[PDB]
Design a protein around this ligand. Structure first.
Ligand SMILES: Nc1ncnc2c1ncn2[C@@H]1O[C@H](COP(=O)(O)OP(=O)(O)O)[C@@H](O)[C@H]1O
Ligand SMILES: Nc1ncnc2c1ncn2[C@@H]1O[C@H](COP(=O)(O)OP(=O)(O)O)[C@@H](O)[C@H]1O
Ligand SMILES: Nc1ncnc2c1ncn2[C@@H]1O[C@H](COP(=O)(O)OP(=O)(O)O)[C@@H](O)[C@H]1O
Ligand SMILES: Nc1ncnc2c1ncn2[C@@H]1O[C@H](COP(=O)(O)OP(=O)(O)O)[C@@H](O)[C@H]1O
Ligand SMILES: [Mg+2]
Ligand SMILES: [Mg+2]
Ligand SMILES: [Mg+2]
Lengths: 97, 49, 442, 433, 447, 443
């Protein structure tokens, strides 16, 4: 246990984690404006253009292979990955929209 | 499974030897690391021995 | 005072009649480029012209970038100046077209005036609302919070949104903490615990600030200037807020994209509505592009249609070549590295060189700005080095003669100091003459 | 209104300026001179306004300072709204992430648009009071409010999504809404007494909405889901042609059913001389397609060597391109037309000029070029403005002439000072003696 | 000292080795000879240490075996810590994913750094006992522990995140913590003795030294050094940090550079951030493109422009990108705005002194006659061949099981390892054996 | 059975203790200077002190440069690491050629380590959280760890594990009465199967029944496993893979290999130098052998100039088969061997000698004895004349079809008509050029 703790302890961060939040946090304040109403960002450009999407999307990929979506990520009934990798990944996928 | 033969006899883990420290800025600071690696003792298990 | 090949020029230094002086404002000689450059200065002061492109073509050490700092200093801080190099327009995130037209939106400025409301005071109660009706009711809220801000000269209660209340929960405030709340923006800053609760505990990490003087509600007007490209980035992508939805809106897609024309149409539509209300005032600016010969043919051909566009202001170019091959073309040979269609809509201001006495006044006035004392024999020797090696070698050797004067404890530059600068440091032609004789690639 | 308009070289030209018999006036709508070019451009204008034919290419050639790009600007300005106009550069098709042929196909899909219309219902009226009903533990909100106008006043019960949009977006009794039934979103337009609102008309009205969308947008949208993110970010390219073929049959079926009508747009390519031979043969095939817009080209160079080959082909283009295209040429202008163009640039720039400054500016415009005089008219008002008078004098034009030098004068100065300027072999005399 | 240091050619040179009057000593700090080059390099050293001027380029030229790269190594070693030094190659800027001009701009942003400091609080003290409180169904943990030092012993109540970091990192009563308030992370530094013998196989969180002094809560200042290139790729996009580690960056928009320049100038005006003028060193600058030459000709006149040291190593030849043979291998527009330092050949005694200090660096004991013969074959052939014969001579001596180097080892190492000119004579004598320019080769013996 | 492909007839250089090379020894005939000098290079690698030494082997085809490279690679032995490499292989588009070149210089070196690991095994009895039934306030006692009671044959012990190795225990779908294999230092979990005591519970089961592991619960052993320093550099560079989601997604996120900074190598050889200060490891140099050096670019040559001035660059052997030719990447530079004269100045040239008619006869002879074919003397002299007429590789190429025609003609020895039939069915270079000289429409 002495050699285990002597080998365990020198884990030096190469710079810091305070070097990552030091040079990222801006000294300038929030200063909100009509800025936020001016945006219409891209993921809400998907939402605001629902009529053009609903009217102009017609064509379908008429040829597909089923059970290829499960194999492309490696999560199926048998693979090199473990048992709850597909379960925790399918649950974190199941929550994220 | 043919290459999941016995590797751990002739493999080093290489995560115990503090050599994957490129992942160490995710959950460790600088003064946490210097203050954590200044403090590793021999001479207490030598006392109990 | 840091001096790096500049700060000796305080503008062009022209008269009211227009005639340029010989020695005025860190300039010696060069009457046509300074007076014509002042005509360009008045052309920016017209606030009417657009699409005008004037390139400055000349050799090295002739004063093109110094004339660019002369027009940038002659315009003043109220006129926006955008320094830019043609080598900087290459990007892999977006095309060079978006950076070029985006820079054309970076040159223009637009000053606004607006009033905002300021609220401050000591927090008394944080509690949901109850009260009555025109028709009877008993059970009551959706979770908003009345914040009773106790100021010095007044006590008022205000109802807030759940988002600014969420930032109030973020600031970890309590009963008796001085906060700062902006009405129009919604940002929350805490000043600290009030001075009345300083005697509650003997030691506390929270500093004790006094009560803010004045009323609860305050108003003021700002003459803040903000560029139109800053409004375009404000119209393009979310910047960042204090809530989770705004911060994740930033974190999701922070990579900058190309901007469509209809977005700029709505931006200058509501900007034109602001200038129809009399609030804002549109002022053009300057996009100065360094080393135009390094540009690709695509940026040149988009400069052809871009100079035919409306919002493109007076753009000053600087090219230091002649009949050379254009980048991106194989057999096209054109003057200045510029295609002849872009050169047809360009205006050339020829730069004049300098004599021996004008090199002596460049070294002289640069020595007075550099605060070094030069003797007349070393001044004539630096004049002969100015007429033998280069101008930049004599201006480069102004400082080591003063350094050797400091090591030799002398206050003036002597002959042996500049000859020691000739021995310790070599120019171009001595370096080529030495590198001509090679044993194994010397 | 309120297209962004500062002073451009192409700002004064608004419309082609032709009569009903297509004979051009001398001074009409910013365009003076070039009677045959404006008449033939009017034939192209009624060719686009006819729309019964397609797959035609035209070329506008001529010397510099003739306005072939200004002629195409007059065609695009006289084209009006609701018709797509694509103005691209000849070197714009060269890209690293996108192939030149697929970018040219992308421009050919960008030129033609589709109009699709539908009808929606709208209820606009003043709110009297709002009375929602929910539960402190359960949920299941039950909204009721009253909508009022000049001749109707009724109470509307609300569903779950009406209280979702009614509580997501703050509204009052004094505030007035306008609700679409199909969209489900609320338009809080105005407010009552302290807003704008002061409404008239019936409560529920049905109006038609028309949307214009080009074929390129449908191509990248029907490519994949993230082709919309590639439509905004511009990271598209190299679409499969099954989307183009099935989209062509779907558009033809929409034309046969009468659902979607298309608008034949104009494709304008600037500086088409330095184009690759692969794009030349690709235009030679793509001009014969069914959905092929009218293409206007502006060959700006002279006779030289085409990029991609070794021989000097005439016109800078192969003959396979020029065989299936019509060519309009322009000629030089007279001395009076330069004074007229500088007069209408004085009217566009809002610059008051004198007669002698217009005569000397006309003479130095004949001698040197059109563009140098078209900038000396700009700086002459500012040399005049430094003297604090709006009137432009001849001294300002002479000072602006001696200050701003012509290209040929500094060509003489360069040839006189060749020891100063660096040569082809890099030799330069940076010293004096 | 624990910069990784085996025996290098540039390992013995530690510092420039100059006096206060800038006159160089004959033998000082690993550098022997080149008095004018070391004095002028000391002028460059006090030019960087002054920091009041910028936008200057210098060039160190000379024949081979003179040590211009060793002179720049002496400048970088005498520069000390906290100043950035960028040493790139001339052919390193040529890339397929990155343009040469934007990679040169990336090096020009890599050369200059920024120092930003702030103050944080720290509470370090020995733990007496830990008493947390949670619920079997509800949650909402309520922690209490006691912190003790030599002159203070108090109980600290903990919040939710203190028990989050206190349970996701194993700690005991005997274990001693040091907590930062702003960072919120715990430093389990040392232990007393108490709890080690509970489990045979345990977790991964055990740490013991502690013997603390001082006050409990202390405030100290932390200083971070960050170059402008890092701020450029970080303010480019979010995945520019992943491009900062993986190296998949390139072609940044110049609005980040312009607004970052005005933001850095505003940080200098406000006094918040001080910058350090670093040195940019480019090795083998002769084979550089003319576009990078004109780009240096513009970029030397910028405001944030570091001191550039160049080492032109070739001779007079044809520049890459043009057809004419320009002198020095560089155009005159680059050499006009730059200063040039030249080096000369060495004497016979200085080769023996350099081989003596390489014997001191390599820890090799040499004889007098082996140093004389090694000095003679170092004068005749080259410096590098003798500087490797000193290495192999200790091993031909080591096969005889003595540490002393004899002349027989140097003669054997001379007859075994051949010089370039000797095998040039052997190649010219055996041209039928070696393959010619046209691919003809006599692989047989008889015709 | 035994596959022979232009090699495996050389078992080293075959030198004496005095140094003098024999004429016929170890699959080599002639070539005394390159074999004895090559043995001096072998001892130079056995010195474990030298670095930066570069020795190129220059000669014509069929002279024995790559055979000498397999002679030094076989003379060094399996304990010395050998890195075969071609100069055409250093071109990469993911990273630069500099990173592959210096990376290969880190691939040549080796470093053997010794370490002890703990081995736990046994039948799983209980999987249950801990109580220590006083609540202490801190918990309604647990945060979810699991005591795993491993029942071995000679002992029964209970152990407490991390939640990650318990998560892999949940991954292996083990239950009460399953034999597992758990490593202490690494944390990897392997299941052997259901124990033999529960074989009679069901008549048919997909889970195989393994016996109980003999011995104790805790076991220790020491390994003398060797691992290259570049393998430690890849272990220091990118995450490889684990059994958890965070490790596998750490692999899946950025698996594309990048360039390595110098400070990372400084920390790697810093803790490696700490391991050699403890007396655990031993540093041994190696060999990077580069084939076809004339195919290299000028950038790899100029980085080889500074790379040979570096410290860790070991004895690198080159092989170039050209002369006064133009360097790749240069226009007017003409230099010997395709190598620039600065790199050729720090290079060492070992000249290769050709072979006579009798030496070609011993090459065909000994290659025939290694190939286990019987050749008559008339066909041996005919293959000697073809060795002195067409090439060496054409006679060594035609050793096998004569035995094939001997197998079809049921003969056990190579005859005159078989090698003449090999002359008729197969043609050499000069007959192919002489035939292709006469063309009707580009024959
Ligand atoms: N009026 C002036 N007075 C003093 N020095 C000048 C003046 N004009 C230019 N210089 C010198 O010229 C240098 C700038 O040259 P610049 O004109 O930028 O070269 P280029 O023409 O190649 O862009 C500066 O170092 C500055 O000292
Ligand atoms: N018919 C016209 N009426 C008015 N202005 C014209 C006319 N023709 C040309 N111009 C002028 O010519 C300029 C455009 O020239 P341009 O077409 O770009 O030259 P090029 O044909 O060489 O490209 C504009 O400034 C415009 O004022
Ligand atoms: N002060 C010195 N005295 C003698 N030899 C030196 C000195 N400095 C360097 N050298 C020799 O020169 C070698 C480095 O040469 P280098 O500068 O790389 O030449 P090049 O740059 O032309 O390739 C060193 O290994 C060393 O042997
Ligand atoms: N001295 C030798 N002894 C035995 N075989 C040899 C000898 N020299 C050459 N060879 C044979 O010649 C063949 C080709 O020689 P090789 O080393 O490939 O030439 P290169 O290095 O020029 O490609 C090898 O397979 C080898 O077996
Ligand atoms: Mg044109
Ligand atoms: Mg310049
Ligand atoms: Mg070198």
């Amino acid at each position: 246990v002495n050699k285990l703790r002597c080998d365990r302890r020198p884990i030096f961060g190469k710079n810091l984690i305070d070097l990552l939040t030091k040079d990222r946090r801006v000294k300038y304040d929030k200063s909100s404006i009509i800025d936020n109403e001016l945006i219409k960002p891209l993921q809400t450009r998907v939402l605001d253009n629902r009529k053009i999407i609903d009217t102009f999307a017609v064509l379908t990929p008429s040829a597909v292979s089923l059970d290829m979506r499960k194999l492309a990520l490696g999560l199926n009934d048998d693979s090199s990955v473990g048992e709850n990798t597909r379960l925790k990944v399918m649950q974190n996928c199941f929550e994220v929209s | 499974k043919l290459f999941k033969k016995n590797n751990q006899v002739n493999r080093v883990d290489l995560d115990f030897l503090n050599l994957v420290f490129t992942l160490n800025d995710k959950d460790l600071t600088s003064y946490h690391a210097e203050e954590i690696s200044k403090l590793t003792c021999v001479k207490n298990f030598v006392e109990e021995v | 005072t840091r001096t790096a090949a500049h700060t000796h020029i305080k503008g062009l230094g022209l008269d009211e009649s227009g005639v340029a002086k010989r020695v005025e404002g860190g300039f010696v000689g060069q009457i046509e480029a300074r007076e014509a450059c002042g005509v360009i200065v008045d052309l920016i002061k017209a606030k009417k012209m657009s699409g005008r492109a004037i390139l400055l073509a000349g050799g090295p050490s002739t004063g093109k970038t110094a004339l660019a700092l002369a027009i940038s200093q002659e315009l003043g801080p109220k006129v926006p100046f955008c320094p830019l190099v043609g080598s900087e327009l290459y990007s892999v995130e977006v095309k060079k077209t978006e950076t070029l037209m985006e820079n054309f939106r970076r040159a223009i400025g637009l000053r606004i005036k607006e009033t905002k409301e300021v609220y401050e005071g000591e927090v008394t109660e944080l509690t949901p609302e109850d009260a009555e009706n025109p028709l009877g009711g008993y059970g009551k809220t959706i979770s908003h919070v009345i914040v009773g801000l106790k100021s010095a000269k007044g006590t008022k209660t205000l109802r807030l949104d759940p988002t600014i209340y969420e930032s109030i929960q973020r600031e970890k405030v309590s009963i008796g903490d001085v906060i700062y709340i902006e009405a129009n923006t919604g940002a929350v800053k805490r000043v600290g615990r009030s001075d009345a609760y300083a005697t509650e505990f003997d030691l506390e990490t929270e500093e004790y600030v006094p009560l803010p003087k004045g009323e609860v509600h305050k108003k003021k007007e700002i003459v803040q200037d903000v560029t139109l490209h800053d409004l375009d980035v404000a119209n393009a992508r979310p910047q960042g807020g204090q809530d989770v939805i705004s911060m994740m809106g930033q974190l999701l897609k922070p990579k900058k994209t190309e901007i469509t024309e209809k977005l700029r149409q709505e931006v200058n539509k509501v900007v034109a509505k602001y200038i129809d209300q009399g609030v804002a005032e549109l002022i053009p600016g300057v996009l100065f592009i360094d080393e135009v010969n390094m540009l690709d043919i695509e940026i040149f051909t988009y400069l052809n249609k871009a100079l035919e566009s409306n919002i493109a202001p007076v753009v000053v170019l600087a090219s230091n070549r002649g009949m050379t091959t254009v980048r991106g073309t194989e057999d096209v040979i054109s003057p200045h590295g510029v295609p002849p269609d872009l050169i047809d809509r360009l205006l050339i201001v020829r730069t004049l060189p300098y004599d021996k006495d004008e090199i002596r006044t460049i070294i002289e006035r640069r020595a007075t700005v550099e605060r070094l004392q030069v003797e007349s024999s070393a001044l004539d020797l630096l004049a002969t080095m100015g007429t033998e090696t280069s101008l930049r070698y004599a201006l480069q050797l102004l400082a080591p003669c003063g350094i050797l004067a400091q090591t030799s404890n002398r206050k003036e530059i002597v002959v042996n100091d500049v000859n020691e600068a000739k021995l310790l440091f070599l120019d171009a032609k001595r370096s080529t003459k030495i590198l001509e004789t090679s044993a194994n690639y010397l | 209104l309120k297209s962004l308009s500062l002073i451009a070289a192409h700002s004064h030209i608004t419309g082609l300026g032709l009569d009903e018999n297509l004979q051009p006036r001398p001074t009409s709508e910013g365009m003076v001179g070039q009677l045959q070019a404006r008449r033939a451009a009017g034939v192209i204008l009624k060719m686009v306004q006819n729309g019964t034919i397609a797959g035609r290419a035209v070329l506008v050639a001529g010397p510099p300072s003739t306005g072939k790009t200004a002629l195409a600007m007059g065609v695009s300005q006289s084209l009006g709204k609701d018709v797509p106009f694509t103005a691209i550069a000849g070197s714009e098709i060269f890209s690293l992430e996108l192939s030149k042929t697929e970018a040219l196909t992308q421009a050919f899909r960008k030129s033609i648009g589709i109009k699709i219309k539908e009808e929606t219902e709208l209820i606009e009226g003043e709110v009297v009071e709002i009375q929602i009903d929910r539960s402190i533990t359960g949920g299941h909100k039950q909204g009721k409010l009253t909508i009022k106008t000049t001749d109707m006043e009724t109470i509307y019960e609300l569903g779950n999504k009406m209280i979702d949009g009614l509580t997501k977006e703050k509204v009052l009794a004094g505030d007035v809404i306008s609700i679409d039934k199909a969209s489900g979103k609320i338009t809080k337009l105005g407010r009552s007494f302290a807003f704008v609102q002061c409404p008239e008309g019936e409560l529920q009205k049905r109006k038609t909405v028309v949307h214009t969308v080009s074929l390129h947008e449908i191509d990248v949208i029907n490519s994949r889901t993230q082709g919309f993110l590639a439509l905004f970010t511009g990271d598209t390219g190299e679409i499969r042609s099954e989307v183009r073929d099935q989209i062509n049959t779907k558009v033809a079926e929409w034309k046969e059913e009468g659902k979607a009508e298309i608008v034949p747009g104009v494709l304008f390519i600037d500086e088409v001389h330095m184009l690759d031979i692969e794009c030349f043969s690709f235009i030679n095939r793509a001009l014969e397609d069914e959905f092929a817009p009218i293409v206007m080209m502006a060959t700006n160079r002279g006779v030289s060597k085409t990029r991609g080959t070794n021989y000097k082909s005439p016109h800078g283009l192969p003959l396979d391109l020029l065989d299936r295209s019509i060519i309009i040429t322009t000629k030089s202008y007279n001395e009076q037309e330069i004074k007229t163009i500088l007069s209408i640039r004085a009217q566009e720039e809002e610059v008051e000029l004198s007669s002698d400054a217009l005569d000397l500016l006309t003479k130095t415009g004949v001698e040197t070029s059109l563009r140098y005089s078209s900038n000396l008219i700009s700086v002459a008002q500012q040399i005049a403005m430094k003297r604090k008078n709006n009137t432009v004098e001849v001294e300002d034009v002479k000072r602006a002439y001696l200050l701003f030098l012509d290209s040929a004068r500094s060509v003489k100065y360069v040839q006189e000072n060749e020891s100063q300027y660096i040569d082809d072999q890099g030799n330069v005399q940076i010293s004096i003696a």
